[PDB]
Write an enzyme that holds these catalytic residues in place. Structure first.
Site, PDB file in Angstrom:
ATOM      1  N   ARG B  21       1.164  -1.107   0.323  1.00 49.48           N
ATOM      2  CA  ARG B  21       0.147   0.112  -0.032  1.00 49.48           C
ATOM      3  C   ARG B  21       0.794   1.086   0.299  1.00 49.48           C
ATOM      4  N   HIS B  51       8.969   3.373  24.411  1.00 47.68           N
ATOM      5  CA  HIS B  51       8.210   4.649  24.679  1.00 47.68           C
ATOM      6  C   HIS B  51       6.657   3.967  25.949  1.00 47.68           C
ATOM      7  N   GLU B  58      -1.982   5.086  24.950  1.00 48.17           N
ATOM      8  CA  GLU B  58      -2.935   4.611  23.627  1.00 48.17           C
ATOM      9  C   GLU B  58      -3.643   3.931  23.917  1.00 48.17           C
ATOM     10  N   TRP B  80      -0.399   8.765  16.611  1.00 45.44           N
ATOM     11  CA  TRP B  80      -1.522   8.958  15.708  1.00 45.44           C
ATOM     12  C   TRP B  80      -1.707  10.456  14.784  1.00 45.44           C
ATOM     13  N   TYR B  94     -10.241   2.451  16.538  1.00 42.10           N
ATOM     14  CA  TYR B  94     -10.974   0.916  17.441  1.00 42.10           C
ATOM     15  C   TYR B  94     -11.844   0.985  18.087  1.00 42.10           C
ATOM     16  N   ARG B 126     -17.275 -19.513  24.993  1.00 43.75           N
ATOM     17  CA  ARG B 126     -16.120 -19.126  23.960  1.00 43.75           C
ATOM     18  C   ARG B 126     -16.833 -18.619  23.209  1.00 43.75           C
ATOM     19  N   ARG B 127     -17.201 -17.520  23.630  1.00 40.08           N
ATOM     20  CA  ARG B 127     -17.783 -16.816  22.660  1.00 40.08           C
ATOM     21  C   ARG B 127     -17.498 -15.044  22.879  1.00 40.08           C
ATOM     22  N   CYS B 146      -5.359  -2.975  12.324  1.00 41.58           N
ATOM     23  CA  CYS B 146      -4.518  -3.863  12.189  1.00 41.58           C
ATOM     24  C   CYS B 146      -4.327  -5.090  13.261  1.00 41.58           C
ATOM     25  N   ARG B 166      -4.477  -8.641  11.589  1.00 39.23           N
ATOM     26  CA  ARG B 166      -3.878  -9.221  10.228  1.00 39.23           C
ATOM     27  C   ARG B 166      -3.398  -8.797   9.423  1.00 39.23           C
ATOM     28  N   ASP B 169       3.748  -4.758  11.431  1.00 39.98           N
ATOM     29  CA  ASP B 169       4.746  -4.055  10.941  1.00 39.98           C
ATOM     30  C   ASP B 169       5.832  -4.924  12.359  1.00 39.98           C
ATOM     31  N   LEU B 208       8.323  -6.990   7.429  1.00 40.29           N
ATOM     32  CA  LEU B 208       9.411  -6.612   8.117  1.00 40.29           C
ATOM     33  C   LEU B 208       9.443  -4.697   6.132  1.00 40.29           C
ATOM     34  N   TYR B 209       9.582  -4.042   6.885  1.00 42.21           N
ATOM     35  CA  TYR B 209       9.810  -2.758   5.744  1.00 42.21           C
ATOM     36  C   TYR B 209      11.015  -2.931   5.416  1.00 42.21           C
ATOM     37  N   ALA B 263       5.869   4.115   8.016  1.00 41.91           N
ATOM     38  CA  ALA B 263       6.058   3.678   6.460  1.00 41.91           C
ATOM     39  C   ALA B 263       3.951   4.428   5.891  1.00 41.91           C
TER      40      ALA B 263
HETATM   41  N1  LIG Z   1       3.841   1.371   8.793  1.00 42.29           N
HETATM   42  C1  LIG Z   1       3.033   1.288   9.601  1.00 42.29           C
HETATM   43  N2  LIG Z   1       3.133   0.421  10.802  1.00 42.29           N
HETATM   44  C2  LIG Z   1       2.952   1.029  11.775  1.00 42.29           C
HETATM   45  C3  LIG Z   1       1.586   2.389  11.811  1.00 42.29           C
HETATM   46  C4  LIG Z   1       0.934   2.524  10.587  1.00 42.29           C
HETATM   47  O1  LIG Z   1       0.031   3.026  10.697  1.00 42.29           O
HETATM   48  N3  LIG Z   1       1.830   2.119   9.350  1.00 42.29           N
HETATM   49  N4  LIG Z   1       0.839   1.948  12.963  1.00 42.29           N
HETATM   50  C5  LIG Z   1       1.060   1.523  13.721  1.00 42.29           C
HETATM   51  C6  LIG Z   1       0.504   2.278  15.824  1.00 42.29           C
HETATM   52  N5  LIG Z   1       1.194   1.780  16.237  1.00 42.29           N
HETATM   53  C7  LIG Z   1       2.594   2.668  16.478  1.00 42.29           C
HETATM   54  C8  LIG Z   1       3.257   2.310  17.190  1.00 42.29           C
HETATM   55  C9  LIG Z   1       4.403   2.907  17.656  1.00 42.29           C
HETATM   56  C10 LIG Z   1       4.947   4.423  16.280  1.00 42.29           C
HETATM   57  C11 LIG Z   1       5.926   4.842  16.485  1.00 42.29           C
HETATM   58  O2  LIG Z   1       6.865   5.157  14.867  1.00 42.29           O
HETATM   59  N6  LIG Z   1       7.054   4.646  17.135  1.00 42.29           N
HETATM   60  C12 LIG Z   1       8.087   4.815  17.789  1.00 42.29           C
HETATM   61  C13 LIG Z   1       8.201   6.217  18.203  1.00 42.29           C
HETATM   62  C14 LIG Z   1       7.668   6.840  19.117  1.00 42.29           C
HETATM   63  C15 LIG Z   1       7.432   8.107  20.127  1.00 42.29           C
HETATM   64  O3  LIG Z   1       6.858   8.405  19.935  1.00 42.29           O
HETATM   65  O4  LIG Z   1       8.072   8.302  20.907  1.00 42.29           O
HETATM   66  C16 LIG Z   1       8.740   3.870  18.434  1.00 42.29           C
HETATM   67  O5  LIG Z   1      10.472   3.913  17.364  1.00 42.29           O
HETATM   68  O6  LIG Z   1       8.946   3.056  18.704  1.00 42.29           O
HETATM   69  C17 LIG Z   1       3.942   4.268  15.116  1.00 42.29           C
HETATM   70  C18 LIG Z   1       2.621   3.475  15.299  1.00 42.29           C
HETATM   71  C19 LIG Z   1       2.520   0.381  14.198  1.00 42.29           C
HETATM   72  N7  LIG Z   1       3.305   0.814  12.922  1.00 42.29           N
HETATM   73  C1  LIG Z   2      -1.232  -1.500  12.157  1.00 45.88           C
HETATM   74  C2  LIG Z   2      -1.872  -0.672  12.829  1.00 45.88           C
HETATM   75  N1  LIG Z   2      -2.484   0.693  13.516  1.00 45.88           N
HETATM   76  O1  LIG Z   2      -2.869   1.280  12.475  1.00 45.88           O
HETATM   77  O2  LIG Z   2      -3.111   1.040  14.773  1.00 45.88           O
HETATM   78  C3  LIG Z   2      -1.017  -1.211  14.457  1.00 45.88           C
HETATM   79  O3  LIG Z   2      -1.484  -1.119  15.801  1.00 45.88           O
HETATM   80  N2  LIG Z   2      -0.108  -2.644  14.755  1.00 45.88           N
HETATM   81  C4  LIG Z   2       0.574  -2.237  13.298  1.00 45.88           C
HETATM   82  O4  LIG Z   2       1.631  -3.310  12.894  1.00 45.88           O
HETATM   83  N3  LIG Z   2      -0.547  -2.128  12.036  1.00 45.88           N
HETATM   84  C5  LIG Z   2       0.906  -2.011  10.575  1.00 45.88           C
HETATM   85  C6  LIG Z   2       0.579  -2.869   9.832  1.00 45.88           C
HETATM   86  C7  LIG Z   2       1.444  -2.266   8.963  1.00 45.88           C
HETATM   87  O5  LIG Z   2       1.713  -2.216   8.300  1.00 45.88           O
HETATM   88  C8  LIG Z   2       0.292  -0.902   8.613  1.00 45.88           C
HETATM   89  C9  LIG Z   2      -0.879  -0.803   8.486  1.00 45.88           C
HETATM   90  O6  LIG Z   2      -1.292  -0.808   6.595  1.00 45.88           O
HETATM   91  P1  LIG Z   2      -1.878  -1.752   6.079  1.00 45.88           P
HETATM   92  O7  LIG Z   2      -2.268  -3.340   6.699  1.00 45.88           O
HETATM   93  O8  LIG Z   2      -2.060  -1.221   4.895  1.00 45.88           O
HETATM   94  O9  LIG Z   2      -3.909  -0.892   6.421  1.00 45.88           O
HETATM   95  O10 LIG Z   2       0.600  -1.004   9.718  1.00 45.88           O
HETATM   96  C1  LIG Z   3     -19.502 -24.909  15.934  1.00 52.83           C
HETATM   97  C2  LIG Z   3     -19.354 -24.587  14.362  1.00 52.83           C
HETATM   98  N1  LIG Z   3     -21.031 -24.482  14.012  1.00 52.83           N
HETATM   99  O1  LIG Z   3     -22.012 -24.120  14.503  1.00 52.83           O
HETATM  100  O2  LIG Z   3     -20.995 -23.787  12.148  1.00 52.83           O
HETATM  101  C3  LIG Z   3     -18.693 -25.018  13.525  1.00 52.83           C
HETATM  102  O3  LIG Z   3     -18.809 -25.373  12.162  1.00 52.83           O
HETATM  103  N2  LIG Z   3     -18.030 -25.584  14.048  1.00 52.83           N
HETATM  104  C4  LIG Z   3     -17.675 -25.743  14.795  1.00 52.83           C
HETATM  105  O4  LIG Z   3     -16.534 -26.325  15.654  1.00 52.83           O
HETATM  106  N3  LIG Z   3     -17.823 -26.286  15.907  1.00 52.83           N
HETATM  107  C5  LIG Z   3     -18.583 -25.810  17.515  1.00 52.83           C
HETATM  108  C6  LIG Z   3     -17.448 -25.209  18.410  1.00 52.83           C
HETATM  109  C7  LIG Z   3     -18.402 -25.775  19.496  1.00 52.83           C
HETATM  110  O5  LIG Z   3     -18.216 -27.483  20.193  1.00 52.83           O
HETATM  111  C8  LIG Z   3     -20.040 -25.377  19.316  1.00 52.83           C
HETATM  112  C9  LIG Z   3     -20.470 -24.864  19.415  1.00 52.83           C
HETATM  113  O6  LIG Z   3     -21.082 -24.000  20.825  1.00 52.83           O
HETATM  114  P1  LIG Z   3     -20.473 -22.357  21.750  1.00 52.83           P
HETATM  115  O7  LIG Z   3     -19.083 -22.766  20.378  1.00 52.83           O
HETATM  116  O8  LIG Z   3     -20.626 -22.380  22.782  1.00 52.83           O
HETATM  117  O9  LIG Z   3     -20.859 -21.447  20.610  1.00 52.83           O
HETATM  118  O10 LIG Z   3     -20.071 -26.400  17.788  1.00 52.83           O
END
Ligand SMILES: Nc1nc2c(c(=O)[nH]1)N[C@H](CNc1ccc(C(=O)N[C@@H](CCC(=O)O)C(=O)O)cc1)CN2
Ligand SMILES: *[C@H]1[C@@H]([N+](=O)[O-])C(=O)NC(=O)N1[C@H]1C[C@H](O)[C@@H](COP(=O)(O)O)O1
Ligand SMILES: *[C@H]1[C@@H]([N+](=O)[O-])C(=O)NC(=O)N1[C@H]1C[C@H](O)[C@@H](COP(=O)(O)O)O1
Ligand SMILES: Nc1nc2c(c(=O)[nH]1)N[C@H](CNc1ccc(C(=O)N[C@@H](CCC(=O)O)C(=O)O)cc1)CN2
Lengths: 264, 264
Positions: B21, B51, B58, B80, B94, B126-127, B146, B166, B169, B208-209, B263
């Protein structure tokens, strides 16, 4: 299959006794992950015979966006009967959320069409996700979705998928769930002209019911056989146009089926 | 930390080159899982200084249901800033989904209060899930979540949690995300009178970027130090009433900080 029997053994050895919703009792672990390379073969359990008919029809039913069990009955599939109401309705479970997730401002989002669009136009995207976990509609569903959330990934011309399954009945449910999603990955890849990659399964509460212990010991005594091969015989015009007859599973020679009661 | 440096090395050795992206380029793997036993210590990376101020604020911000960056600025947290609009808004990211997920029929669901109710009345459930992945509101968010979906689990008087992330970074984001969720698990457990169990981290596209390679090699040359201990100094009346001053991290003696560009 090796990964599957390994999980079964791990639940027996490491699981803790946990009460549950159904009153049955389980042995449970939390958090597990397995990977299936779909090029090695179609991951259908061989240590017991699985009913492919039910697996395939359930998936086609999801893809139609249907939540009424009429279609399954028309096709002699009865796996959803216990949860359906008098009219055969389950509420806005899986297929409804996949095809027609409702928004506040009144729209319906077809997540499957969206994913197709993403795979065809932005394959590197890290946001190619389908969710059934619609918080606003949970209270209308017969059961909360077990297989809740899945993500696609493309690298090197191959399509992978990861499923988050919050709750997993290891004996009854898991063999179906693995096959179901493997099948979807094969369909998706066909529609997008990709090769198949990995299916990654991730579990939350992964458990064996207390009244599946005999069945589990029996199955663990059996040696896995070679995996079958999935053949898709034609390329339909869309992901929504597959038919049961389009799939062939070649070289499936399982050990006998093992009956077990479902915990309701 | 051992699990963290292991992942970094795995991405270097096994990752494939993937465009993204942001136009930066990554090395990427798909699907990984790690487990942290929270009784062994607080999982804050020691091979570079993190930090804590930004991490803690956050989390408190999420819990308030706030999506405007004013609160973070009031507290000199600028992590942010790059995504916020002229008014400091991020859209219904979030905290909004956690505290006030909007339904079609007009309601707002407070998933955090729901989870508390579940943990206090139905701990075997389990929910017990919180999702930020509100399909109907994705298009209004600055970034798609993320860390998308998390589940709690109780066994033997201990509280565990699994996060599905999902997109990760590994260099910048992951150290924050692990600490953030570990912190929440400690808060939740305190409020519910449970002990802490495991934090299970599951990744989708874990990367890793390309412009973090020097930083990665540097950090991989360093030996991890012993984990610090988290002390929560009082028990607030609710999960929404924590303050920055309530937390002590004792015995945190990291290697120096390593700067890396984000990034966008
Ligand atoms: N690609 C990319 N990567 C990400 C996010 C993104 O949207 N894009 N968003 C994420 C949300 N979390 C963070 C966590 C840390 C930082 C960051 O930059 N941290 C510093 C500096 C911390 C500070 O402000 O002091 C560090 O060195 O750890 C930015 C977003 C993390 N990684
Ligand atoms: C996303 C992020 N965030 O936006 O809050 C977080 O908490 N952790 C991350 O690792 N993070 C990363 C994943 C990716 O490198 C970018 C988001 O980009 P898309 O996956 O293209 O949405 O931030
Ligand atoms: C749930 C199930 N389903 O309902 O479609 C499926 O596809 N796979 C399962 O393994 N499945 C199981 C998990 C659990 O033993 C029960 C659902 O009960 P709760 O977890 O209490 O909701 O069916
Ligand atoms: N606790 C419990 N376990 C479950 C479900 C549940 O809601 N509760 N629902 C799940 C949805 N999937 C299935 C899969 C298989 C069956 C089943 O019963 N299968 C047979 C018989 C198949 C057939 O009809 O021929 C077997 O032996 O594999 C039921 C639900 C699976 N496990």
């Amino acid at each position: 299959m090796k990964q599957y029997l390994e999980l079964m053994q791990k639940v027996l050895d490491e699981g803790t006794q946990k009460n549950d919703r159904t009153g049955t009792g389980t042995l449970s672990i939390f958090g597990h992950q397995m990977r299936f390379n779909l090029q090695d073969g179609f991951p259908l359990v061989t240590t017991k015979r699985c009913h492919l008919r039910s697996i395939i029809h359930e998936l086609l039913w999801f893809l139609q966006g249907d939540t009424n069990i009429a279609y399954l009955h028309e096709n002699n599939v009865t796996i959803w009967d216990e949860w359906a109401d008098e009219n055969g309705d389950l509420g806005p479970v899986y297929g409804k959320q996949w095809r027609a997730w409702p928004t506040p401002d009144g729209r319906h989002i077809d997540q499957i069409t969206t994913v197709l669009n993403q795979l065809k136009n932005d394959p590197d995207s890290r946001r190619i996700i389908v969710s059934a976990w619609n918080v606003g509609e949970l209270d209308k569903m017969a059961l909360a979705p077990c297989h809740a959330f899945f993500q696609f990934y493309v690298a090197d011309g191959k399509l992978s998928c990861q499923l988050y399954q919050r709750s997993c009945d290891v004996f009854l449910g898991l063999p179906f769930n693995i096959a179901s999603y493997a099948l979807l990955v094969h369909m998706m890849a066909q529609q997008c002209d990709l090769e198949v990659g990995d299916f990654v399964w991730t579990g939350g509460d992964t458990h064996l019911y207390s009244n599946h212990m005999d069945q589990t010991h029996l199955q663990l005594s059996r040696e896995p056989r070679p995996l079958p091969k999935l053949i898709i015989k034609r390329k339909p015009e869309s992901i929504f146009d597959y038919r049961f007859e389009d799939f062939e599973i070649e070289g499936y020679d399982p050990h006998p089926g093992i009956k077990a009661p479902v915990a309701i």
